[PDB]
Ligand binder design. Structure first.
Ligand SMILES: O=C(NCCCCc1cc2ccncc2s1)c1cc(-c2ccc(F)cc2)cc(O)c1O
Ligand SMILES: [Cl-]
Ligand SMILES: [Cl-]
Ligand SMILES: [Mg+2]
Length: 213
């Protein structure tokens, strides 16, 4: 089996069904004690939580689900009726994410879209009945952060106040995205310095709030 399957099984055997906090703990324990994996982790997760609680978004888009750690993190804090759409290119990971959300009891809040962001973003309005997004979590290929931000704007999916929150802007890093949003009058940006998941290595989140054209 794969590392991702082992993380899912560990959750199934060491967390409580329907308890998202126990799911997060189990993943963080496994990834600390057994095998590193690219979940956002607890250090950066705490900053995500604070952001989610500040904005109480009704409709969140996530690029890059992986095993569902960030989707569980965000969905557990959503208000009733609020929704998360998460896009995952790897079908094995899409299936693990679905099972992770099922175990956590969050499946009614989250729709896991298996496919590439550059193919799926243009379908959001018509296919998934999206008007505009309240928040976007970027956690996919680091060289896609900038092109997908520009694609989101092109598609009319951003509104005044839409919050972009971007993982890994330091490690592995997303230099073009950071330079673009930080230099654009269409974004108000804040950096939240933290640590790479499960490591004593500096990383951070970028929050970039869209201001309109
Ligand atoms: O690559 C990372 N994350 C993206 C995986 C790409 C998955 C995709 C999902 C999807 C959905 C839709 N369209 C297209 C795509 S492409 C990543 C890597 C590290 C890291 C840090 C230090 C290391 F030494 C080694 C890895 C840490 C992280 O937190 C990451 O998130
Ligand atoms: Cl994650
Ligand atoms: Cl961590
Ligand atoms: Mg990441």
């Amino acid at each position: 089996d794969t590392k991702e399957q082992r993380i899912l099984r560990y959750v199934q055997q060491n967390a409580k069904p329907g308890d998202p906090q126990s799911v997060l703990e189990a993943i963080d324990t496994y990834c600390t004690q057994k095998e590193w994996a690219m979940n956002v982790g607890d250090a950066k997760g705490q900053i995500m939580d604070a952001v989610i609680r500040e904005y109480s978004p009704s409709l969140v888009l996530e690029l890059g689900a992986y095993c569902g750690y960030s989707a569980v993190r965000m969905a557990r804090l959503l208000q009733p009726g609020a929704r998360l759409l998460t896009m995952e290119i790897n079908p094995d990971c899409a299936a693990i994410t679905q099972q992770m959300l099922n175990f956590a009891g969050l499946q009614d809040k989250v729709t896991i879209l298996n496919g590439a962001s550059q193919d799926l973003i243009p379908q959001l309005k018509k296919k998934y009945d999206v008007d505009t997004l309240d928040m976007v979590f970027l956690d996919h290929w680091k060289d896609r952060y900038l092109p997908d931000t520009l694609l989101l704007e092109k598609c009319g999916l951003l509104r005044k106040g839409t919050v972009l929150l971007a993982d890994n802007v330091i490690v592995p890093g997303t230099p073009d995205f950071l330079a673009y949003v930080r230099g654009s009058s269409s974004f108000e940006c804040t950096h939240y310095s933290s640590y790479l998941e499960y490591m004593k290595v500096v990383d951070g989140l970028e929050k970039a709030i869209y201001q309109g054209p």
